[PDB]
């Protein structure tokens, strides 16, 4: 996944999943990686 | 392009699958009933 | 699903959703006359459809 | 109006990419397909002997270490004897007892050979190399990882023939009027090179399963792996598995009697062996044939090819000698379940069928079996006869 | 996750085959670690 | 009025109106009243309207009044070409269309 | 399009000819 | 855009994919749809050549040459012939149910041509523009009885008509309705019908047009001439003109005597012996079953020897079809033949 | 390789089976390898043959060396700007 | 009995692969005791229905008044 | 990948097609070959 | 050489015999084909 | 033993051999042809 340069501030989620049923830790919420 | 036609080419799989579908129901289904057939009987007038 | 600033689903939140598009790459065309003769069906419809 | 002229009758197209835009995978699947139409099995992919017949049938056939079975595979003559070698590895697959098969099928094969010296024991017998060659060597039996693995090994050795005919420009007649051994002798030491640098755990597991079988049984009708079990073994390796590929899958008005001699030159040239890769399974032929000698030894090498083929024999028994000592390595015997149940079906019938014929070839009596020293009174065993009351009941059923 | 099926049928010991059924044949099953 | 592609109008696809039949003399009647003058007639006609359409015309228009129209095929727009119309029945485009 | 036959129309073989096209030596490599 | 203002990471990227491709939606385009260029058919039969064709031809012509008239010398070129073999065209894009072409191929369209029309292929060109390429061919001694006048009517009827209808023109309508009242040979028509998913496109059935009536007839005419029959029957041809009735009905009973040919009759008469000796076999066989009647009785019959009966009653009656085959091939051809003569 | 479509090679024996079907075209291909062989100090490198579609890929992307692997997802002109607001 | 005696399988086969040529798929009805009822199927518009299909109305592909097909008995009743 | 997606789906695109070939090579089979209608029994 | 022999003519037997079974269905196909009447069975009385 | 089914084999395949002589020499007898008759002739 990606974020645009320029909106890092957003909500942010990846949801993998098989059929119909997710994974371990999906709703994933990852966060911003570098200060500010 | 390649994108374009790469989710072309998932459809057209299901659209011809479907179509598999078809004619595996009319092909067993002919299969079976081509026994049952009552054969015609023909005797001379005379 | 709408979100306040921190996120918390906002169920009273009256407001209005559009959808405006824009396309996308180089404007292209074609006109070939009789498009027939030599089998052009790019450009055998106008609009190019 | 209108006579019925030729150039009246309607013709049919059909939708096809032109095969030169297409990529070489889905040129070599269309054109299969295309091929497979003068075949004549392009029957649906996905589509009655009840399976109460089938089971009661092996449970008898499988009696007294396979004695019931391998008395009817010997009484045959020389065509239901293939047929019934081929429904018993077919059925032996569908409940997969082919370890039980082969186990007693090498024993009493064995036995039968037992008092006839040991160089000849697979070339004098009657079911030892047919039963091998069905197993390893047939469209039902052998899967598609295995004939992958069989094409690896000696495909480069068959193109290495292929190039040496075609420097040499060595015509067709050439090659079937003169010594294999003469002519493709670079080809046949390419053989001889990958050969070592192959192990026997690379073997696709069911060609390690049966040489190791063999080998067991080979031993228990000798007398601590003997060298005569080392021969033996090198004998269903280069003569009865690798042998069994060359001369197996490997690829490449007029009046009305005029149309079909045109046609059926074709037909018998696309469906024959080349000469080049004939001569080529002659030359691995004889260089099992030279494994013999040196696991018995000299014998005055006075030639050129003599020498090769010597050598070739004894670095094949150098080969075997070590591979087939090691521990015991797992070896599983698989084979293809593409056509199970129906192959199962043709199985039965067949055994059915058989012992129906032969009750009424002894009852009347015209038997000649095809086994020099099998007489009419091994076949009236008592099991035999129980055989018959479950063949004539499940006639009916 | 489904079975695993297969077929030990008891032998006489000279090498006839015993259609009775009177043999009880547990099988043990130990995954090597 | 260029019948779609390159296409000759067969009679599997959309029907024939017979010559000098009571069809015949009804698109004479109902054309040469508009026009005034005997000068114009007809030298070929086709039926369009399949029994899809016909079914959602009655559905649609039900108490509503029903008009007898001409619209030229030339100056039609270039997709309710006549192959078209035998599919989707005359699409009216978001401008309207005048009768 | 056509194609040129002089003589004996053109049979199948010379037929899908034009229809496809409508739409230091080696013995010393071997030596060295 | 929720207020005005973008949500999340808005620039959506949306992929339109076309929906079903219905059958009758599809489009033609080009000029083999209306107007289909006919070529000489490779199924011909001229009749018989042989040998003597070349030494009563080289006999008679250097017998008038070699002296006066017919010096030669001069290696003239006999003009081996331009014989056209066409190859129409025409192009069927598939589109779904509110016109719009499809990116890629993969569709099923099967092309069947009849009376005349010989589908060679259908290509898929990658992206769905399925190109079908046909050749119509004529048949040969139905042609030559229409005489070159009804032809170039015909020819010129489909000329005009190839881009406007039958309308336009004031009058073509009666003139085709003649044509077909005229109940000649030739359906002077070919058959198209293209099929996406075995459904008939819109348009279907295809009439396409002929428009070399008169070039076949006169490459199949000079082809009679370059024949080596041919030649000789415009040798006598020319006899007739000047006079000499004679020598001219003479060269008919040469030319009917080469042409009455030799081979085809004894292979009629070996095999029609052949065949009348086998039935006096068969009625032998029914003779020798009082043979095996009057004896055995005793001697019973294996279970092998009924199977081995079925199968040499199956090969008689297998060999019994083989023999009359021939016979019937041989009379049709001879047939053919005499019909020639 | 004397292999007549994709699933006739396999990785093991193929490094073996260059040259050996004595056809110019892969004899050349036996010369451009043992010219790397040799080209280095010693001739012992061992040879993998990797088709498109084998569990054994990654051995020959994570080489590539301006793409991205899974351990760094960066190219190398993004590498280049993040050494150089770095300096 | 209602599955084996259905009240109409069509006049022939041919017009099953006719419906599936530029149409749809096959239909299953399943045994069904009661509930075929109505018109239509076998009331008196089943006459019309079945002189427009080309079809017979009556137990639709014979009249069945016998167990066995016999020659014998349709000479003495000719 | 985009390429090598593009050229299995399209490789599943020949196989599709060449059943639906073969399916209908059945279908005109049983209906062309005449099967599908009463054999004829000549009682005297 | 008398086992390369019998594994070459045992493979040309068997091949042909497969096609001789091919050779019968396309014989019966068409023999039903190009024919004018359903399969006509002469039945008397025993 | 092996001369024994090389024979056979020989003398078998020989057989074969006249026999797709034989039967496509039928499929282009047949082929050749607009309808054929009953085989029926009673009387």
Request: aromatic letters at 8%; one cysteine or more.
């Amino acid at each position: 996944y990606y974020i645009p340069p320029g909106a890092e501030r957003h909500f942010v989620e990846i949801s993998i999943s098989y059929h119909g049923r997710p994974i371990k830790g999906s709703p994933f919420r990852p966060r911003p990686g570098g200060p500010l | 392009q390649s994108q374009s036609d790469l989710l072309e080419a998932q459809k057209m799989v299901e659209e011809q699958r479907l179509e598999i579908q078809r004619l595996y129901k009319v092909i067993e289904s002919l299969n079976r009933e081509k026994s049952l057939v009552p054969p015609v009987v023909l005797a001379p007038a005379n | 699903r709408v979100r306040n600033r921190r996120g918390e689903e906002v169920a009273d939140a009256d407001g209005a959703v559009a959808l405006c598009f824009s396309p996308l790459g180089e404007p292209q065309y074609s006109f070939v006359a009789d498009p027939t003769s030599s089998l052009s069906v790019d450009a055998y419809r106008m609009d190019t459809m | 109006p209108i006579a019925s002229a030729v150039e009246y009758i309607p013709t049919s197209a059909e939708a096809a990419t032109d095969p030169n835009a297409l990529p070489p995978q889905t040129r070599e699947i269309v054109a299969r397909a295309r091929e497979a139409e003068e075949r004549g099995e392009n029957l649906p992919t996905l589509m009655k002997v009840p399976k109460a017949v089938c089971r009661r049938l092996w449970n008898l056939l499988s009696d007294n270490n396979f004695i019931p079975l391998l008395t009817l595979l010997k009484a045959s003559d020389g065509d239901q004897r293939r047929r019934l070698v081929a429904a018993a590895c077919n059925l032996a697959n569908s409940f997969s007892a082919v370890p039980d098969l082969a186990y007693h099928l090498f024993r009493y094969e064995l036995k039968w050979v037992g008092h006839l010296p040991a160089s000849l024991f697979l070339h004098s017998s009657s079911l030892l190399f047919p039963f091998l060659s069905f197993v390893t060597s047939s469209k039902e039996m052998l899967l598609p990882g295995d004939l992958s693995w069989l094409h690896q090994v000696m495909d480069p050795v068959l193109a290495a023939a292929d190039s040496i005919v075609a420097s040499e420009h060595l015509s067709a007649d050439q090659i079937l009027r003169e010594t294999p051994a003469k002519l493709f002798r670079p080809a046949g030491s390419l053989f001889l090179e990958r050969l070592k640098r192959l192990s026997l755990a690379d073997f696709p597991c069911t060609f390690r399963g049966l040489l190791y079988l063999l080998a067991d049984a080979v031993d228990a009708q000798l007398r601590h792996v003997t060298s005569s079990a080392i021969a033996t073994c090198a004998e269903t390796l280069i003569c009865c598995f690798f042998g069994n590929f060359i001369l197996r899958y490997a690829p490449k008005d007029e009046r009305t009697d005029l149309v079909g001699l045109r046609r059926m030159r074709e037909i018998a040239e696309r469906s024959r062996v080349p000469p080049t890769y004939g001569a080529m399974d002659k030359l691995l032929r004889q260089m099992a044939s030279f494994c013999w000698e040196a696991v018995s030894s000299e014998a005055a090498l006075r030639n050129v090819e003599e020498q090769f083929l010597a050598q070739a024999g004894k670095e094949i028994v150098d080969w075997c000698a070590l591979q087939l000592k090691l521990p015991r390595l797992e070896s599983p015997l698989k084979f293809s379940s593409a056509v199970l149940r129906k192959a199962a079906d043709e199985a039965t019938g067949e055994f059915l069928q058989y012992i129906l014929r032969l009750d009424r070839d002894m009852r009347e009596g015209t038997f000649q079996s095809g086994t020099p020293g099998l007489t009419e009174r091994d076949v009236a065993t008592p099991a035999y006869e129980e055989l018959l009351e479950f063949a004539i009941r499940a006639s009916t059923y | 996750g489904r079975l695993a099926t297969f077929t030990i049928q008891a032998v006489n010991s000279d090498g006839t085959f015993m259609r009775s059924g009177d043999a009880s044949f547990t099988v043990y099953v130990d995954p090597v670690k | 009025t260029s019948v779609g592609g390159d296409v000759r109008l067969s009679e599997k696809d959309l029907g024939a109106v017979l010559r000098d039949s009571d069809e015949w003399a009804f698109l004479e009647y109902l054309l040469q009243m508009s026009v005034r003058t005997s000068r114009v007639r007809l030298l070929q006609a086709w039926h369009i309207a399949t029994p899809h359409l016909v079914s959602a015309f009655e559905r649609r228009t039900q108490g509503r009044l029903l008009t007898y129209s001409f619209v030229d095929t030339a100056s039609l727009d270039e997709d309710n070409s006549l192959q078209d119309i035998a599919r989707r029945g005359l699409k009216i485009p978001m401008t309207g269309m005048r009768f | 399009p056509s194609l040129k036959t002089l003589d004996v129309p053109a049979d199948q073989q010379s037929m899908n000819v034009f229809l496809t096209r409508l739409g230091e030596n080696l013995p010393t490599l071997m030596s060295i | 855009t929720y207020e005005g203002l973008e949500i999340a990471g808005s620039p959506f990227e949306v992929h339109f994919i076309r929906g079903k491709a219905v059958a009758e939606a599809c489009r033609v385009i080009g000029q083999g749809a209306k107007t289909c260029f006919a070529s000489p058919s490779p199924h011909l039969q001229l009749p018989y050549v042989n040998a003597e064709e070349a030494r009563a031809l080289i006999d008679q012509r250097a017998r008038e040459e070699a002296w006066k008239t017919g010096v030669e010398g001069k290696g003239e070129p006999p003009k081996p012939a331009v014989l056209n073999n066409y190859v129409n065209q025409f192009v069927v894009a598939v589109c779904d149910e509110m016109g719009n072409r499809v990116s890629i191929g993969g569709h099923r369209v099967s092309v069947r041509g009849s009376r005349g029309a010989k589908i060679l292929q259908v290509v898929d060109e990658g992206c769905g523009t399925y190109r079908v390429d046909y050749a119509v061919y004529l048949p040969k001694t139905p042609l030559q009885q229409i005489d070159v006048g009804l032809l170039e009517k015909i020819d010129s009827y489909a000329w005009i008509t190839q881009a406007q209808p039958d309308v336009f023109v004031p009058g073509i309508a009666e003139a085709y309705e003649h044509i077909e009242s005229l109940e000649l040979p030739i359906h002077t028509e070919a058959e198209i019908e293209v099929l996406l998913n075995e459904q008939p496109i819109f348009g279907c059935p295809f009439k396409v047009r002929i428009c070399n009536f008169v070039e076949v007839f006169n490459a199949y005419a000079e082809l009679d001439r370059r024949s080596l029959l041919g030649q000789q029957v415009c040798a006598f041809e020319r006899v007739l003109e000047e006079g000499n009735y004679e020598e001219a009905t003479s060269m008919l009973w040469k030319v009917q005597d080469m042409a009455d040919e030799k081979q085809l009759k004894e292979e009629v008469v070996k095999v029609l012996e052949n065949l009348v000796r086998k039935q006096l076999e068969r009625e032998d066989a029914q003779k020798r079953e009082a043979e095996e009647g009057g004896c055995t009785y005793l001697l019973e019959e294996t279970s092998k020897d009924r199977e081995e009966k079925r199968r040499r009653e199956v090969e008689e009656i297998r060999s019994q079809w083989e023999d009359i085959h021939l016979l019937r091939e041989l009379l049709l051809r001879l047939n053919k033949n005499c019909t020639d003569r | 390789f004397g292999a007549h479509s994709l699933d006739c090679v396999h990785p093991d024996v193929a490094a073996a089976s260059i040259g050996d079907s004595q056809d110019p075209v892969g004899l050349r291909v036996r010369a451009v390898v043992q010219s790397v062989q040799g080209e280095h100090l010693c001739n012992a490198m061992r040879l993998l043959v990797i088709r498109q579609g084998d569990p054994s890929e990654q051995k020959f992307f994570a080489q590539l060396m301006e793409d991205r692997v899974p351990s760094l997802l960066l190219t190398f002109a993004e590498f280049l700007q993040k050494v150089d607001m770095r300096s | 009995q209602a599955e084996r005696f259905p009240v109409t399988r069509d006049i022939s086969l041919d017009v099953k692969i006719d419906q599936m040529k530029a149409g749809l798929t096959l239909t299953r009805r399943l045994p069904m005791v009661y509930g075929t009822a109505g018109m239509a199927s076998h009331g008196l518009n089943g006459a019309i229905r079945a002189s427009v299909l080309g079809v017979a109305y009556p137990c639709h592909p014979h009249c069945v008044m016998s167990l066995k097909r016999s020659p014998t008995l349709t000479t003495e009743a000719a």
